[PDB]
Amino acid sequence: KEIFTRLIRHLPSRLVHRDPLPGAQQTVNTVVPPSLSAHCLKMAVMPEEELWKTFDTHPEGLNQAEVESAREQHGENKLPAQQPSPWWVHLWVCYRNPFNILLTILGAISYATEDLFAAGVIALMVAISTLLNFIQEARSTKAADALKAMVSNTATVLRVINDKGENGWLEIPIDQLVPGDIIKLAAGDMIPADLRILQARDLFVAQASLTGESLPVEKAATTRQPEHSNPLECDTLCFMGTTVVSGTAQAMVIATGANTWFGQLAGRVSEQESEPNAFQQGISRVSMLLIRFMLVMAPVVLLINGYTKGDWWEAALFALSVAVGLTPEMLPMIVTSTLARGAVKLSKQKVIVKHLDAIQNFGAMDILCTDKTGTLTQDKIVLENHTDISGKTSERVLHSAWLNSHYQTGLKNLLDTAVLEGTDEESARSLASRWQKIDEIPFDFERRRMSVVVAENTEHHQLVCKGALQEILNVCSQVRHNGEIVPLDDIMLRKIKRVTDTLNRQGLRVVAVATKYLPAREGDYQRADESDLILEGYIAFLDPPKETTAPALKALKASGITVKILTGDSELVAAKVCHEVGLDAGEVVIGSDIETLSDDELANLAQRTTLFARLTPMHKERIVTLLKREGHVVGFMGDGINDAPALRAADIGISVDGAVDIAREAADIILLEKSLMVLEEGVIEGRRTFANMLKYIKMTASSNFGNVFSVLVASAFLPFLPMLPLHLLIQNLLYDVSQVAIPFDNVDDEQIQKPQRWNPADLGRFMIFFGPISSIFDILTFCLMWWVFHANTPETQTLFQSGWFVVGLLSQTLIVHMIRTRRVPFIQSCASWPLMIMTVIVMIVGIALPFSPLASYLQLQALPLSYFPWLVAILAGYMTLTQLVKGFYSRRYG
């Protein structure tokens, strides 16, 4: 009957669940629909002269009023699942709960005849509960949205600043982009919307997400392709979700938001998120458990009281009032508030959480995959030697590397920075004023080199390519030895291999450089122009390991996290780095060994292997996917161009604020600095946050089930309701006010010591265990008020009901300090000061409520002074019994 249970209010699918991330592979629904492919094809070949009039765009850019007009016309650069609802809509959906409406209707029906100010006060209590829930949810979702917007991909636009009318280059969030807006693209920038290249040089974009081709594709300002016949392959348009590999460009936004190629009929807008993740499934399962409890218990109470006291319209109200404590509507408030408090406290620790549910995984992660550069090493190399094949230092190698590092337009490397810094000013200036760039062949993993074609004159050009030693040697036919040029024979090949292996075993990364002279040519150089090269030498450099890497790794191992290194570098350098930081590399697995293994074989091998070397991005993604095989939660750390699938293939993806745009787009956690200590501290605090959330749900559900059980067992014998439903609503409201400060509780270090596994079925066991314990003392209080205080007849019922009230509210508020931890309270474990203060305040308010002037309005009678010793005895006995009985639940259940 789950199809009929629509009482659950799901959290918005931006606080939980991931973003679409337009990387949903090559599969497309009928390859886009008509009037979209045709529109893109028309836009590709549309002359640039009439392009300005179509979008009301000018070369100066867009001013304010124009950008707001365009945003109103075309919407906002977002997806329909990212716009928050208005606060009044949220308040209305919080009030239209199928339980609040029923409570108000039953209050009216019971008290429409000859007794007002009762239905009104019940409705007012319902409104106060709704307002409290709405306030918590709204504050927490606002904080979550602010934290998500803190780390957002930005685009560089013209716009208008200096209202006297001066252009500029503003970095604005990609959601503010409107159609017909001018942006500029450099290396590492993801495409923010469907573009139209106005003017570009050496612009290469990686489109493996959309067209499925790994090699980057050159994108020119004006089309040079004979026929298009396809919108995805035209060289003048750039689609959202792809990254810029190298070169520079300036383009115009043509589509925006849902109108983008991916955002319409190519993903995102195709159906919805039919499959929920682990966190959503767990929340739904807990909500279903609570609904089952209510639907099994409340009708029984209704039937019993209707058969006994013959007031059905009041018995139903009373049963609903006791059931409301077990409502599922507590779940959105609890989850949102606790996870948002955890996310804010993480943001104070240089950890930004993009969606709330990731916190669960960030506490459940037991395997952490990453690269050795930046996380284990310092990413800045200290020592570097530019030598030829004979070991002697050579200035020609340094100058060739300087050319290749200066005229390249790709992302800045550590070698590129060190080469540009280690070259003196005079020689650098001479080379810059003597050589000029012509062409650039970017970096791809099929050949693992990078080429730059420069020239000092108009007669001949020089192609200078640098890359890993083996890849360079594969395409070198001559070597410059002793100032002469000699064929690269096998003897020199093996000598170079041995010397470079010896260097690699010292932790020195070796990058070879080759140059070739070609006649002047008026055509674009291709990857086929990297043959018969002249090997100048190599550069050996040391990226030293961080001082805070070994303690961080030890702390991560203490927390239960297994660290695995997925690197594309050499096996020897990675092994040396792992040994220098205390990591046990064991036997290494290179990427060429897993290309023949089956999925089962590689999944079994990756569990024992610690270091994986010479991996392509596909290998990293496959390893991350197969490491989730045995119920493990895998976290992948990466900040590269090609880390988009792996970051998404992991159970949790972690990136850095200084990453490329797609790495931040595909990540779930963003670290403000690339450190493992920050990651470990964040994992600890997220474990505390998720433990607090579980504790809050657990205690609330258990106490409310105890109250419902007490009502169910001890209402048939009484000739009146044990507690008036108004008193129940006040009790629940004050308990919720007390519980507001549970997100701020303290968590034992023994609870967050190991990765957290969340079983929603444990809540049922906890409720069953800790409900009857409260019910026993509830029945004891009933007997005390029946016999000791002689509240026998209905006429003197207000003494009885109020007599339970101060017991119902106080114990429910005190039991929190007993069942929160697993140890003995107040000596080995103490609740946080905000929780202590809230408990004391709520206890004081509950004690003083029967004595307050409002007690006459709330149908509460004052209490004789002889009742307080009995109340203290009951509370102390309840606390002692639960403290002595916790051990049985600990042993038999957990």
For Mg ion, the binding residues (CB under 5 A) are: 189, 202, 439, 524, 706-707, 774, 808, 812
How many whole angstroms separate alpha carbon 445 and alpha carbon 620? 13
How many whole angstroms separate alpha carbon 325 and alpha carbon 736? 10
Residue 196 forms beta bridges with which residues?
237, 252
Catalytic residue among 175, 235, 366, 371: 371
Angle at 255 between CA 252 and CA 259, to 5 degrees: 175
Which of 225, 548, 852, 880: binder of its own copies (CB under 8 A)?
Answer: 548
Stretch that binds its own copies, among 1-9, 240-248, 435-443, 501-509 (CB under 8 A): 501-509
Q: 97 and 130 in contact (C-beta within 8 Å)?
A: yes
Q: 194 and 40 in contact (C-beta within 8 Å)?
A: yes
Residue 361 forms beta bridges with which residues?
none
Is 886 near its own copies (CB under 8 A)? no
Q: How many CB atoms lie within 10 A of CB 633?
A: 22
Element (H, E) at 505: none
**Nearer Cβ to its own copies (259/387):** 387
Rg (CA), the chain: 34
Number of shown-chain residues binding its own copies (CB under 8 A): 14
**Catalytic residue status for 371:** yes
Q: 803 and 867 in contact (C-beta within 8 Å)?
A: yes
**529 is known to lie in a ligand binding site:** no
Stretch that binds its own copies, among 44-52, 170-178, 361-369, 545-553 (CB under 8 A): 545-553
**Nearer Cβ to its own copies (418/626):** 418
Non-local (6+) Cβ contacts of 88 within 8 A are none
Least Å from the CB of residue 16 to its own copies: 35
Which of 507, 568, 635, 640: binder of its own copies (CB under 8 A)?
Answer: 507
Q: Which pair of structure tokens corresponds to residue 622?
A: 């496959």
802 binds, among its own copies, Mg ion, none (CB under 5 to 8 A by kind): none
Least Å from the CB of residue 842 to its own copies: 21
439 binds, among its own copies, Mg ion, none (CB under 5 to 8 A by kind): Mg ion
**Nearer Cβ to its own copies (383/432):** 383
542 binds, among Mg ion, its own copies, none (CB under 5 to 8 A by kind): its own copies
Least Å from the CB of residue 393 to its own copies: 8
Which of 218, 233, 471, 580: binder of its own copies (CB under 8 A)?
Answer: 580
**Nearer Cβ to its own copies (76/379):** 379
Is 378 near its own copies (CB under 8 A)? yes
Sketch the per residue contact string, 623 through 662, with its own copies: x for CB under 8 A, - otherwise. Answer: ----------------------------------------
Q: Which pair of structure tokens corresponds to residue 241?
A: 């979700």
Cα–Cα distances (Å) from 471 to 96, 476, 477, 511, in that order, read 66, 9, 13, 10
Residue 511 forms beta bridges with which residues?
468, 539
How many whole angstroms separate alpha carbon 148 and alpha carbon 355? 7
Non-local (6+) Cβ contacts of 755 within 8 A are 363, 364, 365, 366, 559, 560, 561, 633, 687
189 binds, among its own copies, Mg ion, none (CB under 5 to 8 A by kind): Mg ion
**732 is known to lie in a ligand binding site:** yes
**736 is known to lie in a ligand binding site:** yes
Inter-residue long-range contacts of 836-843, CB under 8 Å, 24+ positions, other chains counted: 837/741, 838/737, 838/738, 838/739, 838/740, 838/741, 839/738, 839/813, 839/814, 841/738, 842/734, 842/735, 842/737, 842/738, 842/809, 842/813, 843/809, 843/810, 843/813, 843/814
| CA-closest candidate to residue 581, choices 608, 561, 543, 554 | 554
Residue 535 forms beta bridges with which residues?
479, 514
Which of 45, 93, 131, 382: binder of its own copies (CB under 8 A)?
Answer: 382
Is 20 near its own copies (CB under 8 A)? no
**Nearer Cβ to Mg ion (147/438):** 438
**Nearer Cβ to its own copies (334/684):** 684
Q: 760 and 565 in contact (C-beta within 8 Å)?
A: no
Phi, psi of 65 (to 5 degrees): -55, -35
202 binds, among Mg ion, its own copies, none (CB under 5 to 8 A by kind): Mg ion
How many whole angstroms separate alpha carbon 428 and alpha carbon 430? 5
Which of 446, 547, 595, 600: binder of its own copies (CB under 8 A)?
Answer: 547
The position carrying tokens 């300087």 is 402
DSSP 11: P
**639 is known to lie in a ligand binding site:** yes
Is 495 near its own copies (CB under 8 A)? no
Stretch that binds its own copies, among 156-164, 375-383, 687-695, 702-710 (CB under 8 A): 375-383
Which of 70, 240, 508, 810: binder of its own copies (CB under 8 A)?
Answer: 508
Non-local (6+) Cβ contacts of 498 within 8 A are none
Least Å from the CB of residue 191 to Mg ion: 11
Q: 838 and 741 in contact (C-beta within 8 Å)?
A: yes
Q: Which pair of structure tokens corresponds to residue 865?
A: 């002074």
| CA-closest candidate to residue 513, choices 492, 485, 537, 477 | 537
Q: Which pair of structure tokens corresponds to residue 14?
A: 């931006």
Chain centre to alpha carbon of residue 280? 14
**Nearer Cβ to Mg ion (444/524):** 524
524 binds, among its own copies, Mg ion, none (CB under 5 to 8 A by kind): Mg ion
Which of 112, 131, 383, 486: binder of its own copies (CB under 8 A)?
Answer: 383
Stretch that binds its own copies, among 357-365, 493-501, 504-512, 841-849 (CB under 8 A): 504-512
Least Å from the CB of residue 225 to Mg ion: 15
**Nearer Cβ to its own copies (542/773):** 542
Least Å from the CB of residue 552 to its own copies: 12
Dihedral over Cα of 35, 41, 45, 50: its sign: positive
Which of 546, 564, 614, 688: binder of its own copies (CB under 8 A)?
Answer: 546
**Nearer Cβ to its own copies (236/675):** 675
Q: Which pair of structure tokens corresponds to residue 614?
A: 């010479």
How many whole angstroms separate alpha carbon 104 and alpha carbon 729? 12
Is 545 near its own copies (CB under 8 A)? yes
Q: Which residues make up each annotated binding site? A: 329, 639, 643, 707, 732, 736
Please list the active-site residues. Answer: 371
- Contact residues for its own copies (CB under 8 A)? 378, 382-383, 391, 506-508, 542, 544-548, 580
Q: Which residues make up each annotated binding site for Mg(2+)? A: 329, 639, 643, 707, 732, 736
